[PDB]
Design a protein around this ligand. Structure first.
Ligand SMILES: Cc1ccc(Cn2cc(C(N)=O)ccc2=O)c(C)c1
Ligand SMILES: Cc1ccc(Cn2cc(C(N)=O)ccc2=O)c(C)c1
Ligand SMILES: Cc1ccc2cc(C(N)=O)cc(O)c2n1
Ligand SMILES: Cc1ccc2cc(C(N)=O)cc(O)c2n1
Lengths: 317, 317
């Protein structure tokens, strides 16, 4: 035991807890000036005692050397994409088909509803609570290694807030750029004879394709997790909403507008509410993502790949 | 000009025309004994004058040397798979969703209906009317090279019956084994202390995985084309049924039970008719494949990959 090691462990625990409050809860217990006091005190002490430096310390988000290119990662579980609807009647048909296809339809058919973020889908692996790798969705089978870029994201924890993390946990989420950060970036880009971005999605896509993490760190990117891939050494909740509350509870950022609706009429009320809130959110959205809440009914319904919307195989009983 | 070359060109034209009559029309103009008289007369003359041997001659279906393994082929256009339904109401919802999603719905919504063959999906490329390559569907992006095995199939033409073939034409179809051939194969397999097959689909899958084409040729496999991939140097028909009639007209085998139905009620009549014919067809079927006939409405509806049946993105207008 040494005073320095004890000092470094205390600083790291305190900074991680403040980052959770500020980023995931949006309720910081201390001023930003206090968070920075502790942060650069930790950065100073680590440099004075390099033997006690850890790769997952709050001060190690930026890889000091750029990459040459991105490697290819084949996902163990395929990253899915969503099918779409453009009207209340088309949504009501998607529901009616599910009611007919399900063996047993529950009294209230519960849906977990959320705004559809206009971002980029990513997969982030935590091995024993430590961020080891991150990849883009790509084609759903193969993506690109973006580990160094994802580590730079301020609301992405380098380690999970839990004393008993899963052996392996893969978080799937959207990386986007809020309106305020996009406006700063363009003001800076135009007043430095640099490339301006048409919209925040192009700004987010361009930031994640940077080979130098030092640039990526100066791009105000944000993550909101929507789902889990690999999950080993854990009993995941049996409803989709409970899984998102569980990710939130172990340090993962999730969207605050997520609600549970019973049946198509309540789901349509959510779509209308989110449509009227569009101008006030502070980030871009394309619509609403509506899922069946019960995980057993999801497993029963399954997935499609790669099938036309103009053909169906009516199978014999 | 030589008499032998003229003799070989006449034999090849006559045999190809008889194969079309026997396999695609099911109306041979001559007895099987007559077809064989000309076939082994051609085989004899080619061996006596090896300089006039062609790789696409009716006598060159079997590669005399086995393969070591199968190479991988990435399809230029992705090979799709079908979504499914299990009831009249689930089928009626799939239709109702299309009616809501289409910008303009025509007076009769016409469907091209056919029995769902219990076979294996293959892609076959014809370059200037000559069979050059063939592959399995695989995952829809990558498949395996099965050229040597597909050439052995009696109803698969080695050259298209047309004086003006497309520059490149890719035929997509099902390879299956009819009941009569499956019964012979098992009688032979059991009376030779060899492996018997549980059903004709496993018999068909096992035949196409043979590295030696000499074995594959003794397996009574059959093709029925369901669609086109690549098509260069041709104006394809604007309805799906007309494309299948066009493939039939240039020497490609297609299923004889294909019909056009207007609306869901006529389509349900087709499903019931095919369900009652199941015991009489002479090959195995899983249900019926129902497609939108108009190719412009297909292009408008598009395809999905890889999306869950339990989620939908309701997009904003
Ligand atoms: C100088 C400085 C420090 C920190 C922040 C924002 N912030 C605040 C906290 C906090 N209050 O617990 C935690 C993490 C974090 O990133 C800004 C904008 C500027
Ligand atoms: C000996 C022999 C020859 C041919 C056939 C079958 N068949 C017949 C014709 C034909 N009639 O025009 C064309 C091709 C073909 O494969 C069998 C079963 C037996
Ligand atoms: C399964 C899946 C895939 C992509 C998604 C993307 C979003 C999104 N763009 O917000 C939300 C979801 O719930 C998603 N869910
Ligand atoms: C697009 C596509 C893909 C696979 C198919 C398979 C079959 C079949 N198994 O008969 C029929 C079709 O019309 C198909 N159509």
């Amino acid at each position: 035991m040494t005073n320095i090691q004890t000092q470094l462990d205390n600083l790291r625990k305190t900074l991680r807890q403040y980052e959770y409050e500020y980023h995931v809860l949006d309720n910081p217990s201390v001023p930003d000036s206090e968070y920075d006091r502790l942060f650069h005190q930790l950065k100073a002490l680590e440099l004075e005692h390099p033997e006690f430096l850890t790769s997952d310390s709050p001060t190690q988000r930026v890889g000091a050397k750029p990459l040459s290119g991105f490697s290819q990662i084949r996902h163990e579980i395929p990253m899915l994409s969503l099918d779409n609807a453009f009207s209340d009647a088309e949504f009501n048909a998607f529901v009616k088909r599910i009611e007919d296809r399900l063996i047993l339809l529950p009294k209230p058919l519960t849906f977990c509803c959320e705004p559809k973020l206009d971002g980029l889908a990513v997969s982030i692996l935590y091995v024993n609570g430590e961020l080891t790798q991150a990849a883009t969705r790509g084609d759903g089978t193969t993506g690109e290694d973006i580990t160094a870029n994802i580590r730079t994201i301020r609301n992405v924890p380098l380690q999970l807030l839990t004393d008993n993390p899963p052996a392996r946990l893969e978080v799937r989420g959207e990386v986007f750029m809020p309106h305020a950060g996009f406006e700063r970036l363009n003001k800076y880009a135009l007043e430095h004879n640099e490339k301006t971005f048409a919209n925040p999605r192009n700004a987010a896509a361009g930031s994640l394709r940077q080979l130098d993490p030092n640039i990526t760190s100066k791009r105000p990117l944000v993550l909101n997790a929507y789902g889990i891939g690999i999950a080993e050494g854990v009993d995941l909740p049996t409803t989709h909403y409970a899984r998102l509350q569980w990710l939130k509870s172990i340090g993962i950022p999730v969207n605050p507008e997520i609600r549970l609706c019973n049946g198509a009429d309540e789901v349509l009320g959510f779509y209308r509410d989110i449509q009227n809130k569009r101008s006030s959110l502070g980030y871009d959205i394309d619509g609403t993502v509506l899922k069946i809440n019960d995980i057993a009914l999801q497993n029963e319904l399954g997935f499609i790949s790669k099938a036309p919307r103009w053909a169906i195989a009516y199978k014999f009983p």
